[PDB]
Design a protein around this ligand. Structure first.
Ligand SMILES: CC[C@H](CO)Nc1nc(NCc2ccccc2)c2ncn(C(C)C)c2n1
Length: 286
């Protein structure tokens, strides 16, 4: 649209191209997504420090542009830049702290993300990290292949979604974040599934195959089969070295199979892992 000179293609998303753009009324650099209206108009109203601010919604000539605040880098790029040294733990801890603050905010207005991953986690030079694309998956889709036929990752999907629950809760977000948490620590994807049954089975081999004892009602889920192989749970000390006892208790609590048992975001901010949070500035050049 006309009020915006786009100055860069930032990237192909799930729903559209994103451009860095110079709003020439306000003069402000801004991120322009080219893509329900009741829904995405609702989002304009939920602003948190750790949620990427939806500035405007432009439905002109029956198209959809969403104008957001601009952040300089995403988490996935930053994990790749920090591959040989790893992200320092005080940084990992503070980023997790902030994310749970943002999750705790949306979850109380009953907005889920439900497609979290390193790629829609965005960071600035200050030491802040924000959550991007919140509320959109509800508004349209979360599809299997994007608009450019890229396969949407299954790596972070909560197992009740994989097992065919259609009434996900906010717990599916705490699941994903446990997966991103573990990955920030090991420098290696927790559950790197390449199909839905590979994803299911990758979870099972590590956490153990779920039954009626740990997960009440799993065996009557839509896509549960009695023929699932029965694997044994692994020790978290083998799964996420060198994470400490506090981190691992937290991580297993976010990775609980039963969604009712899985730790809430508000409760995670009170876990002893976060007793010593600081806010460090990260090493990042632009
Ligand atoms: C949600 C994922 C999106 C595309 O993969 N990434 C991205 N990346 C942004 N910045 C990453 C970046 C900044 C500068 C250059 C290259 C990439 C960004 N800023 C605002 N937004 C809105 C659309 C959420 C941004 N979105």
């Amino acid at each position: 649209m006309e009020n915006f000179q786009k100055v860069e293609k930032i990237g192909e998303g799930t729903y559209g191209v994103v451009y860095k753009a110079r709003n020439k009324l306000t003069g402000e650099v801004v991120a322009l997504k080219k893509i329900a209206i009741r829904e995405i108009s609702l989002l304009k109203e939920l602003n948190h420090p750790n949620i990427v601010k939806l500035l405007d919604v432009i439905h002109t000539e029956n198209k959809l542009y969403l104008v957001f605040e601009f952040l300089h880098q995403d988490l996935k790029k930053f994990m790749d830049a920090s591959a040989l040294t790893g992200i320092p733990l005080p940084l990992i801890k503070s980023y997790l702290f902030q994310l749970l603050q943002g999750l705790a905010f949306c979850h109380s207005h009953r907005v889920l993300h439900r497609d979290l991953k390193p790629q829609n986690l965005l960071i600035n030079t200050e030491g802040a990290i924000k959550l991007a694309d919140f509320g959109l998956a509800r508004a349209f889709g979360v599809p299997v292949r994007t608009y450019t036929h890229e396969v949407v990752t299954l790596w972070y999907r909560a197992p009740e979604i994989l097992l065919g629950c259609k009434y996900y809760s906010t717990a599916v977000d705490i699941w994903s974040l446990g997966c991103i948490f573990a990955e920030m620590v090991t420098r290696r994807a927790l559950f790197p599934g390449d199909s839905e049954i590979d994803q299911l089975f990758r979870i099972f081999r590590t956490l153990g195959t779920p039954d009626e004892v740990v997960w009440p009602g799993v065996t009557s889920m839509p896509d549960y089969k009695p023929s699932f192989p029965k694997w044994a749970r692994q020790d978290f000390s083998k799964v996420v070295p060198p994470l400490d006892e506090d981190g691992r208790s937290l991580l297993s609590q976010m990775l609980h199979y039963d969604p009712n048992k899985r730790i809430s975001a508000k409760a995670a901010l009170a876990h002893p892992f976060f007793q010593d949070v600081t806010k460090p500035v990260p090493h990042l050049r632009l």
